[PDB]
Amino acid sequence: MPLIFKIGYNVIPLQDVILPTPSSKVLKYLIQSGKLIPSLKDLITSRDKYKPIFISHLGFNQRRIFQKTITKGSRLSSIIAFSTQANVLSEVADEGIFETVYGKFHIMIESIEIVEVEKLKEEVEKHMNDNIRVRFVSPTLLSSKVLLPPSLSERYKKIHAGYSTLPSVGLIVAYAYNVYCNLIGKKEVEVRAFKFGILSNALSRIIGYDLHPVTVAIGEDSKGNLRKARGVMGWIEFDIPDERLKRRALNYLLTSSYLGIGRSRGIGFGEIRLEFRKI
Amino acid sequence: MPLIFKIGYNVIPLQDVILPTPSSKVLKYLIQSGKLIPSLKDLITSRDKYKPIFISHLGFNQRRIFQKTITKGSRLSSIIAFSTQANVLSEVADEGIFETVYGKFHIMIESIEIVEVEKLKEEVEKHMNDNIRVRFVSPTLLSSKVLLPPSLSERYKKIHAGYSTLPSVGLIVAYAYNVYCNLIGKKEVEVRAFKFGILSNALSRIIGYDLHPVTVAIGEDSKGNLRKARGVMGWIEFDIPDERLKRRALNYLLTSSYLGIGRSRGIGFGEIRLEFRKI
Numbered sequence: 001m002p003l004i005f006k007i008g009y010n011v012i013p014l015q016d017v018i019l020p021t022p023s024s025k026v027l028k029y030l031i032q033s034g035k036l037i038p039s040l041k042d043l044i045t046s047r048d049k050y051k052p053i054f055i056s057h058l059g060f061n062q063r064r065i066f067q068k069t070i071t072k073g074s075r076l077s078s079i080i081a082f083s084t085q086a087n088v089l090s091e092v093a094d095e096g097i098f099e100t101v102y103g104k105f106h107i108m109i110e111s112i113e114i115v116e117v118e119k120l121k122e123e124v125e126k127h128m129n130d131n132i133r134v135r136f137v138s139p140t141l142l143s144s145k146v147l148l149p150p151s152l153s154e155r156y157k158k159i160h161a162g163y164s165t166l167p168s169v170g171l172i173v174a175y176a177y178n179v180y181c182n183l184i185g186k187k188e189v190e191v192r193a194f195k196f197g198i199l200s201n202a203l204s205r206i207i208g209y210d211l212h213p214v215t216v217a218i219g220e221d222s223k224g225n226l227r228k229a230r231g232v233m234g235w236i237e238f239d240i241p242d243e244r245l246k247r248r249a250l251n252y253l254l255t256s257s258y259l260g261i262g263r264s265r266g267i268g269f270g271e272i273r274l275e276f277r278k279i
Numbered sequence: 280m281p282l283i284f285k286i287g288y289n290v291i292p293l294q295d296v297i298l299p300t301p302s303s304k305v306l307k308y309l310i311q312s313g314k315l316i317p318s319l320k321d322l323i324t325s326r327d328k329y330k331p332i333f334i335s336h337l338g339f340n341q342r343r344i345f346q347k348t349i350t351k352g353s354r355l356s357s358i359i360a361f362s363t364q365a366n367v368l369s370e371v372a373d374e375g376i377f378e379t380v381y382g383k384f385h386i387m388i389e390s391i392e393i394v395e396v397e398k399l400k401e402e403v404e405k406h407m408n409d410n411i412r413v414r415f416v417s418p419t420l421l422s423s424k425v426l427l428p429p430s431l432s433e434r435y436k437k438i439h440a441g442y443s444t445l446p447s448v449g450l451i452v453a454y455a456y457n458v459y460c461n462l463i464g465k466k467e468v469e470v471r472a473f474k475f476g477i478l479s480n481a482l483s484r485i486i487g488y489d490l491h492p493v494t495v496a497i498g499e500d501s502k503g504n505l506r507k508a509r510g511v512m513g514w515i516e517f518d519i520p521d522e523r524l525k526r527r528a529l530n531y532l533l534t535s536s537y538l539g540i541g542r543s544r545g546i547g548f549g550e551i552r553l554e555f556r557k558i
Contacts, residue, residue, distance in 0.1 A: 148481040156482055159520040166485040166515070168447045198477060202427040203435055206445040206492075213487065236445070241438040 001117070001184065004052075004083045004258045007092070008111030011058060011076040016069060017103035021217045021226070023058035023065045024268035026102050027078060031055070035098050036107065037080075039088045044266065050175075050182035052083040054260045057138060057268035064138050064271070067217040067228075077110075079271075081258045083183060086114075117184060117255070124250040128243065130276035131207055132253070134172065135235040138271030139216040142167045142232070142262045146174055147198065150191045165213035165232045169240075170201030175262050176252035183255065200245060209236040218267065231269070237277075280396070280463065283331075283362045283537045286371070287390030290337060290355040295348060296382035300496045300505070302337035302344045303547035305381050306357060310334070314377050315386065316359075318367045323545065329454075329461035331362040333539045336417060336547035343417050343550070346496040346507075356389075358550075360537045362462060365393075396463060396534070403529040407522065409555035410486055411532070413451065414514040417550030418495040421446045421511070421541045425453055426477065429470045444492035444511045448519075449480030454541050455531035462534065479524060488515040497546065510548070516556075 009027075020026065030036040031044050043053055057064040059077040097106050144161040145153075147170060164171060174197030181189040211234040220226045240246040253274055260270040288306075299305065309315040310323050322332055336343040338356040376385050423440040424432075426449060443450060453476030460468040490513040499505045519525040532553055539549040 144481055144483065147477070149477065152478075156521065159482065161482045161520070162484045164485060166445075166447075166488055168445075168480065198426070198428065199431075201447065202423055203438065203440045204423065205441045206443060208492065209445055209490075211488075213485075241440070242435065 002083050003086070003114060003116040004081065004255075005089075006079065006081040006113040006258050007109065008113075009078045009080065010108045010110045011078055012073050012106040012108075013070055013076070014073070014097065014104045014106055016072055018069050019058065019065070020102055021067070021219045022268060024055045025219070026058065026100060026105070027055050027080065028267065029100050029102070030098055036093050036096075037088060037091070039084065039091065040082060043082065043084065048182070050179045050263075051266065052179065052183050052259050054079070054081040054258070054265045054271070055268060056080065056271055064268070066139060066214070081260070083259070120254045121251055123254060124247060127250055127276055128246060130278060131237055131239050132250070133235055133237040133275040133277065134253070135273040135275060136233050136261075136271070137273055138260075138269055139214050139229075139231040139233060140167075140262055140270045140272070141229065141264065142171050142175060144171065146178070146190075147171055147194060150194055163230050163232075165230050166211060167232055167236075168201040169204045169206065169236075169238055170197035170199075172261060173197060173200045173249045173252060176249070176256040179259050179261075180252045180255045183259070196245075196248070200240070200249065203242060203245070204238055204240045206236065206238045210234045211236060218264075218269075281362050282365070282393060282395040283360065283534075284368075285358065285360040285392040285537050286388065287392075288357045288359065289387045289389045290357055291352050291385040291387075292349055292355070293352070293376065293383045293385055295351055297348050298337065298344070299381055300346070300498045301547055303334045303357075304498070305337065305379060305384070306334050306359065307546065308379050308381070309377055315372050315375075316367060316370070318363065318370065319361060322361065322363065327461070329458045329542075330545065331458065331462050331538050333358070333360040333537070333544045333550070334547060335359065335550055343547070345418060345493070360539070362538070399533045400530055402533060403526060406529055406555055407525060409557060410516055410518050411529070412514055412516040412554040412556065413532070414552040414554060415512050415540075415550070416552055417539075417548055418493050418508075418510040418512060419446075419541055419549045419551070420508065420543065421450050421454060423450065425457070425469075426450055426473060429473055442509050442511075444509050445490060446511055446515075447480040448483045448485065448515075448517055449476035449478075451540060452476060452479045452528045452531060455528070455535040458538050458540075459531045459534045462538070475524075475527070479519070479528065482521060482524070483517055483519045485515065485517045489513045490515060497543075497548075
């Protein structure tokens with residue numbers, strides 16, 4: 001039923017400012033401050049799993065930024081994506097100068113993309129004979145345990161498996177099914193998510209790949225701990241031969257091409273590009 | 280109950296000979312011909328899944344050989360591993376000159392290693408606090424479908440998922456559990472194999488890795504088709520935090536460090552080295 005908004009911002013600093021950790025935080029502030037799109041405040045605060053927001057890392061030139069001072073007026077890029085009602089579009093700032101605790105910046109909207117989720121399925125249909133390339137252009141954090149049998153999840157709820165620096169196709173499409181579900185309002189999925197993921201990496205073929213684990217700062221604590229974490233970057237190209245599972249997976253992946261993948265996407269992690277090639 | 284034999288051969292050609300496809304075939308001939316270890320004939324012919332043999336590819340210097348002429352008397356290496364009764368040890372050739380349809384070669388035994396499977400568990404115990412590095416030194420072929428839900432295996436028995444050029448830890452330990460099972464005589468495992476594999480990659484952490492897909496010839500047909508295939512080479516290092524699943528997996532991996540991994544190991548594919556490091 002609802003729709004997705006993908007807003008492309010050009011950010012420019014107004015002095016020499018030292019970027020915080022990670023970059024995305026600067027705009028996060030502006031949302032919690034309500035200086036830009038106050039409506040989203042609630043949806044930022046929401047600790048609900050698989051929430052539909054994405055405040056990307058700040059991108060210089062072509063690539064994002066991960067663990068250091070920035071020139072006076074360098075041309076930066078960013079992307080915020082989310083989903084509520086078209087009403088919010090009445091109050092998005094379009095232009096402006098905002099101060100933060102970091103500094104002051106000139107925000108100018110470069111692009112706007114709005115689409116309905118059901119309109120995506122149409123796009124899903126024309127790729128049922130293309131190979132699927134998923135490209136992480138941001139540090140992506142995928143837990144392995146989301147693929148643990150739902151039942152048994154109590155027993156092993158003691159030990160932390162961390163983040164699969166080497167992710168299976170099933171894990172990613174499970175996550176995309178999670179965000180797709182929490183989007184269209186579909187409670188209790190983890191069993192279906194599970195079963196679908198197992199089903200997926202069980203009968204899907206990796207065509208080619210380049211991945212590599214990455215260590216990134218996700219922000220200092222209050223008490224002083226500079227939190228670091230392990231994730232995975234690079235691209236992975238594969239295919240699924242079963243028509244059903246393909247159509248479903250494409251329909252979830254398209255969603256992730258906006259809202260991102262895994263967690264925590266509320267801070268720029270999991271940003272992906274989705275590419276296609278023929279046979 | 281039984282035990283494993285790992286025989287290290289030094290092979291030398293007696294003229295200039297053109298190696299066949301793959302290399303391992305040359306010794307395979309000698310087993311079917313019974314020229315070397317006739318007893319193994321039966322166990323070569325056996326198309327039983329997860330049979331306990333391994334006729335490695337011929338290794339020049341340090342590394343195996345995959346898709347071309349060889350000098351008169353170059354010093355080659357090979358390893359044949361398997362499991363039957365100590366009786367066979369009475370008739371292993373030790374030394375000799377054998378002719379083939381390929382040519383004639385001088386075989387000299389360089390090393391002998393015999394161990395009992397229960398003796399392995401002792402070795403398993405002293406690593407419960409080491410990281411596990413699995414190194415494929417041969418093209419390894421792992422099907423993804425071995426991780427499909429046993430029940431549902433009928434429905435999707437139509438489409439071929441091929442070989443996971445990107446393997447999950449679960450897939451490999453599932454395979455090792457398969458060979459370990461068919462070894463000690465333990466019928467009907469695929470459900471336990473399944474459940475164990477899912478359980479494994481669900482709560483295991485990849486520490487580091489380097490993998491890359493490889494295309495290798497597995498032999499021309501009769502009708503003339505030079506069969507090629509996709510597999511995976513490189514190393515992958517990981518760990519499992521649950522004590523139980525670790526002890527089990529180590530106990531299966533040790534077995535695979537002899538009998539090899541996946542299929543088809545009857546021709547040198549799946550040869551691995553198992554390494555350990557502290558924390």
